[PDB]
């Protein structure tokens, strides 16, 4: 506080404000393109949604409700999927999703179900490595526009684990994009338990050339992979939105601190001028 250190501080926080505003702008463009990608992925997702509803409408017997469609009893092992940002600055989003994952692990262990972690994004990977859980499936360096082929390394592993009895149920934790400003973590069930939607009510009778059971066993894994891809893209959009909000708040805070530091600098400047003129007047007299 010597009217020169405060000047350096003011310059520093001004640089912070400029960098943060630039981050907010690029995060806005990122959110735009991520929303575009989500909407471009929407047709596959919803078409397969009503296709699955129609298929499970016909497959109603317990005997043929096997493989991925079976509603297993006496659940023993549960796998949860977590999608997290690869980088920080997201604000409370990473903390929120990891708190949700931790508490969900708490209830799943409360009922006696052993839990295994499958993580997208470096933040969740690092957190779960530090806390103790070894990543059963690890996938990082997912860009803002990931391809479905990039998720296979985890999704196929989870589906094979469920098929082999390793996991009796499957979950995903992702950041839902409620608004441009408001985002919460969400929980979804990955064992199908499909909805008796209008499609399920639809009685359009079909023909299954390779076979009903074969079509079922070939479409359930792809439906699950589509759900995971939707969740990952939703999480990417929420990541960019949360970074936008965090950087807007940081820019506003930096501007407020620049204002306060400018007030302090002006006070120091006036004090320095008063001190020097008082000393000069004393020396003259």
């Amino acid at each position: 506080p010597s009217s020169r250190e405060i000047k350096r501080r003011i310059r520093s926080v001004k640089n912070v404000a400029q960098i943060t505003r630039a981050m907010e702008m690029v995060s806005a463009s990122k959110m735009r393109r991520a929303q575009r990608n989500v909407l471009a992925t929407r047709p596959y997702a919803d078409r397969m949604r009503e296709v699955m509803a129609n298929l499970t409408a016909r497959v109603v017997g317990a005997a043929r409700r096997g493989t991925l469609l079976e509603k297993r009893e006496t659940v023993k092992s549960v796998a949860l999927l977590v999608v997290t940002p690869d980088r920080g600055l997201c604000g409370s989003l990473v903390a929120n999703v990891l708190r949700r994952a931790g508490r969900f692990i708490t209830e799943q262990r409360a009922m006696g179900r052993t839990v295994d972690v499958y993580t997208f994004g470096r933040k969740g990977r690092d957190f779960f490595l530090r806390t103790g859980f070894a990543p059963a499936g690890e996938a990082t360096r997912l860009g803002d526009a990931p391809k479905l082929e990039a998720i296979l390394g985890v999704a196929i592993s989870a589906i094979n684990g469920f098929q082999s009895g390793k996991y009796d149920e499957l979950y995903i934790i992702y950041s839902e994009f409620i608004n441009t400003l408001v985002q919460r973590p969400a929980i979804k069930q990955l064992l199908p338990v499909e909805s008796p939607d209008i499609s399920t009510t639809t009685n359009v009778d079909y023909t299954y050339e390779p076979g009903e059971e074969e079509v079922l066993n070939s479409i359930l894994p792809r439906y699950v992979e589509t759900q995971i891809y939707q969740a990952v893209l939703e999480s990417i959009a929420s990541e960019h939105s949360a970074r936008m909000v965090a950087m807007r708040n940081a820019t506003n805070n930096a501007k407020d601190l620049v204002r306060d530091l400018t007030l302090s600098f002006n006070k120091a400047r006036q004090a320095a001028i008063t001190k020097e003129v008082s000393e000069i007047a004393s020396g003259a007299a």
Binding site: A28, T180, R248, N266, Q270, I273, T274, V277, A281
Partner: protein, 232 residues
């Protein structure tokens, strides 16, 4: 000016950079050998600023209204010079460079320009209500300026897009066709009383005028003139 004030006339006194009066006083005090004061200013800063700017009053016979340009040393308004000037001020008008980039008509920043007399008891309840509503709308636009720059007009929800459009139109409606002007634009001069201005802005805030586009508010002058311009 006091001769004409004593004649009962209303006089407007323009002082260019009262801060230069303050600095001249500081220099005179320094040359006279007086001890400095708090930035090196004259010890008699308050008394000198009171000798001036205290004969500027409204008396029973006449009145001397004033308008003093003020150069704030650096950006320090707390500087003894602008501080002692603000001690003697009844209104402030803030010309801003950003609005001056395109608005060469009076570029007064409505949010940074205040006035002591703008209170219900003096200018009436209607004027205060209209002025506060205009300032509220312009403040909402100022807050949403960053959102508009970053997100766009689409993310901005309903019931605020109307206010943003209204704020654009009302910032455009702070234009006045002058009787005398620099680089005379040819528009006829207009003298709009406060009684007309209050009702005009009230009606602009009352939904009327939402039809005419924003760009046709350059130097319109009155809400009756707004309706006349919309008719053509």
């Amino acid at each position: 000016a006091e001769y004409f004030r004593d004649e009962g006339r209303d006089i407007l006194l323009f002082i260019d950079n009262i801060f230069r009066f303050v600095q001249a006083g500081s220099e005179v005090s320094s040359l006279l050998g007086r001890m400095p004061s708090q930035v090196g200013y004259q010890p008699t800063l308050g008394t000198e600023m009171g000798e001036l700017q205290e004969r500027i009053t409204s008396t029973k016979r006449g009145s001397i209204t004033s308008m003093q340009a003020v150069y704030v040393p650096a950006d320090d308004y707390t500087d003894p010079a602008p501080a002692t000037v603000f001690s003697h001020l009844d209104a402030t008008i803030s010309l801003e460079r950003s609005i001056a980039e395109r608005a060469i008509f009076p570029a007064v920043d409505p949010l940074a320009s205040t006035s002591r007399i703008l209170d219900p008891n003096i200018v009436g309840e209607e004027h205060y209500r209209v002025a506060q509503e205009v300032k509220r709308v312009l403040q909402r636009y100022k807050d949403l300026k960053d959102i508009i720059a970053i997100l766009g007009m689409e993310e901005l929800s309903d019931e605020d897009k109307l206010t943003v459009q209204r704020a654009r139109k009302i910032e455009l409606f702070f234009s006045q066709p002058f009787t005398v002007a620099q680089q005379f634009t040819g528009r006829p001069g207009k003298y709009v009383p406060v009684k007309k201005t209050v009702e005009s802005f009230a009606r602009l805030l009352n939904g009327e005028g939402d039809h005419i586009p924003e760009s046709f508010f350059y130097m319109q002058g009155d809400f009756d003139d707004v309706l006349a311009a919309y008719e053509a």
